[PDB]
Amino acid sequence: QCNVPLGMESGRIANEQISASSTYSDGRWTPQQSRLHGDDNGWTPNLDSNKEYLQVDLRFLTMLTAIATQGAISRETQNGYYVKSYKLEVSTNGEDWMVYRHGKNHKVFQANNDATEVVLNKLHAPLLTRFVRIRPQTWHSGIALRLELFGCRVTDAPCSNMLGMLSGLIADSQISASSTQEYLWSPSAARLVSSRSGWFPRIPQAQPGEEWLQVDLGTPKTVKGVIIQGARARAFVRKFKVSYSLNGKDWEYIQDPRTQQPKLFEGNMHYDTPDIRRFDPIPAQYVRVYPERWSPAGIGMRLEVLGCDWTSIIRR
Amino acid sequence: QCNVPLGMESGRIANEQISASSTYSDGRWTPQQSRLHGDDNGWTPNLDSNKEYLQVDLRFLTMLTAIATQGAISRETQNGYYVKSYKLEVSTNGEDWMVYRHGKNHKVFQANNDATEVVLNKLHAPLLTRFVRIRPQTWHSGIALRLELFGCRVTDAPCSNMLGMLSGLIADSQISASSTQEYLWSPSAARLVSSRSGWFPRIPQAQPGEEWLQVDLGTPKTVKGVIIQGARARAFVRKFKVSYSLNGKDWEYIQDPRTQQPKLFEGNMHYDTPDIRRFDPIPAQYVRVYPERWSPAGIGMRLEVLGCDWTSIIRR
Numbered sequence: 001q002c003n004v005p006l007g008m009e010s011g012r013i014a015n016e017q018i019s020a021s022s023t024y025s026d027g028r029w030t031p032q033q034s035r036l037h038g039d040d041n042g043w044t045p046n047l048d049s050n051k052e053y054l055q056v057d058l059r060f061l062t063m064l065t066a067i068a069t070q071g072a073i074s075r076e077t078q079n080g081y082y083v084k085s086y087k088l089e090v091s092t093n094g095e096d097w098m099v100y101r102h103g104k105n106h107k108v109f110q111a112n113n114d115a116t117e118v119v120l121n122k123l124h125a126p127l128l129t130r131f132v133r134i135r136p137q138t139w140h141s142g143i144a145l146r147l148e149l150f151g152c153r154v155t156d157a158p159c160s161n162m163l164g165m166l167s168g169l170i171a172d173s174q175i176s177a178s179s180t181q182e183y184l185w186s187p188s189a190a191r192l193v194s195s196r197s198g199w200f201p202r203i204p205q206a207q208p209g210e211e212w213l214q215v216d217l218g219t220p221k222t223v224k225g226v227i228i229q230g231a232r233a234r235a236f237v238r239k240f241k242v243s244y245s246l247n248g249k250d251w252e253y254i255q256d257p258r259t260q261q262p263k264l265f266e267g268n269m270h271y272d273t274p275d276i277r278r279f280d281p282i283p284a285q286y287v288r289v290y291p292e293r294w295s296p297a298g299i300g301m302r303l304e305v306l307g308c309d310w311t312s313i314i315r316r
Numbered sequence: 317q318c319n320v321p322l323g324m325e326s327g328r329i330a331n332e333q334i335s336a337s338s339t340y341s342d343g344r345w346t347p348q349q350s351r352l353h354g355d356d357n358g359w360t361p362n363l364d365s366n367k368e369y370l371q372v373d374l375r376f377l378t379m380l381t382a383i384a385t386q387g388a389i390s391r392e393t394q395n396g397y398y399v400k401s402y403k404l405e406v407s408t409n410g411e412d413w414m415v416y417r418h419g420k421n422h423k424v425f426q427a428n429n430d431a432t433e434v435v436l437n438k439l440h441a442p443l444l445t446r447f448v449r450i451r452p453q454t455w456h457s458g459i460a461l462r463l464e465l466f467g468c469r470v471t472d473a474p475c476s477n478m479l480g481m482l483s484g485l486i487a488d489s490q491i492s493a494s495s496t497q498e499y500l501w502s503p504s505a506a507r508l509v510s511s512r513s514g515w516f517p518r519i520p521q522a523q524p525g526e527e528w529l530q531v532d533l534g535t536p537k538t539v540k541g542v543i544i545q546g547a548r549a550r551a552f553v554r555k556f557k558v559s560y561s562l563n564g565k566d567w568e569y570i571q572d573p574r575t576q577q578p579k580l581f582e583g584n585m586h587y588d589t590p591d592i593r594r595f596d597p598i599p600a601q602y603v604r605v606y607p608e609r610w611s612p613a614g615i616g617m618r619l620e621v622l623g624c625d626w627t628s629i630i631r632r
Contacts, residue, residue, distance in 0.1 A: 024632060025628070025629075026629060026631075026632070028632065029632065044632065074632055076631055076632065077631055077632065079632070081632075142632070
């Protein structure tokens with residue numbers, strides 16, 4: 001299951017992966033002291049306010065499912081400090097941020113009640129991200145924070161490997177679309193995370209079923225899912241269908257077994273925070289994502305395909 | 317507490333610090349024989365009248381809180397002499413004098429009833445001064461006086477040091493005002509005690525809250541009070557507010573916690589006799605005194621700031 005400590009306490013998250021908006025000026029409450037069960041104070045900002053944050057760089061896209069926090073007792077004075085509530089803010093690139101929401105509004109996490117006890121919060125909806133910010137909203141005596149993050153990698157699941165949109169392994173020539181906003185479009189614009197724009201059809205406010213992004217994997221693969229992202233009025237896909245082809249001639253949609261019709265996948269709720277959509281493994285060389293509904297600003301999309309190698313050999 | 321003998325009996329007040337308007341012509345009743353419990357006569361003037369005085373130079377600004385007197389018995393004749401009542405007159409410079417008052421009128425201190433006993437008078441209101449004159453009003457047989465003075469230094473209190481208006485440590489460039497009566501004004505005019513004039517705004521009969529004197533301490537300091545003085549129709553401030561700034565950008569007034577509004581400090585009742593106004597210690601580099609009420613002759617002011625060094629380090 002996806003609830004493994006990501007490496008604050010263990011040290012797997014190295015000191016340099018931990019930063020903050022600021023730190024207490026005497027240098028005794030650095031971001032690097034924010035490790036859960038740490039024995040030397042904790043992180044404390046320059047000023048106590050709701051505009052400060054602790055930031056963890058997880059290096060690569062990671063599933064985040066839970067957060068645990070403590071306050072800290074001062075080694076110098078024995079005074080206890082703890083955060084009573086915080087907001088969560090995430091990013092795939094460090095520039096584009098999403099404040100975690102519960103329905104319409106920002107989720108306010110209830111945190112500590114003392115300086116020693118661990119308080120764990122499970123996300124009601126797990127989160128694909130790289131950068132994590134904890135932003136204290138209320139505190140006792142002052143802000144002090146020790147932290148653990150919980151989750152897993154996408155590739156922890158079997159046959160899940162990112163097939164090469166993000167990494168560039170899938171070349172520009174292998175990425176194509178029904179139409180593009182600009183002509184002499186660069187196919188790299190459609191790459192999950194690494195792109196700084198996105199694929200936009202000629203009129204992003206387009207017609208359902210008419211537009212598509214196609215990935216040619218170059219050889220047949222076992223395809224088990226996609227990761228969809230919006231684009232940099234924010235543009236993202238809200239609903240989509242997926243079709244696939246082994247031979248480049250015949251296509252099929254992934255079916256909703258319950259409805260006996262092409263499956264309508266849920267898209268994104270934000271332009272940056274991506275969403276994983278898995279499905280029953282299918283042999284395919286070509287995959288198309290067909291946007292059906294989108295945000296008010298129209299279709300904008302970055303994408304990655306998930307799977308592994310295919311075997312045309314099935315035993316008899 | 318501020319009731320320590322200032323050095324008449326101990327000899328801390330040296331002979332040269334003691335003088336009088338005159339002395340008995342045979343030289344056997346000199347001002348230097350006016351020390352409490354002295355064993356050789358006492359001070360006696362050339363003529364017995366209410367126009368004579370004994371004068372003590374305390375050298376620097378000193379808190380005076382009590383006076384003790386005796387008469388004296390003649391070593392030569394065994395006749396006893398004592399002062400029955402006296403007035404008190406004080407000065408910061410030896411030129412400008414204030415007769416101590418009780419309400420509207422001069423305070424007449426009741427003194428001795430015999431030649432041997434000590435009679436102590438506590439001032440109903442303690443007094444910041446340098447020069448002290450005892451002026452006998454009534455006497456038995458004749459004027460003879462032995463004396464002790466009681467009080468303390470301002471710097472006996474913690475974090476109280478005069479920050480450099482009086483001494484010149486605070487340079488002319490660090491002293492400024494909202495407006496001045498004369499242009500090409502010398503900032504040194506505003507220095508507590510050492511100035512022989514004072515700060516006057518363009519129209520000393522001015523509008524409340526409109527005028528101010530500013531001291532720039534050159535670095536942030538812990539500020540714990542001011543000493544205000546009038547100027548040389550006598551000009552002095554009667555009521556004032558104090559504002560302060562750490563960063564030279566943001567200002568705050570010292571608040572009256574009872575009223576939740578800027579504190580209205582009591583000013584002077586005389587042009588020369590200064591008054592100490594302490595407050596809760598605050599970090600500041602810049603301090604402004606804003607006159608709100610003043611004597612009929614308008615705003616006139618000399619000033620000193622009180623405090624000590626600041627530490628931007630507060631332990632956590």
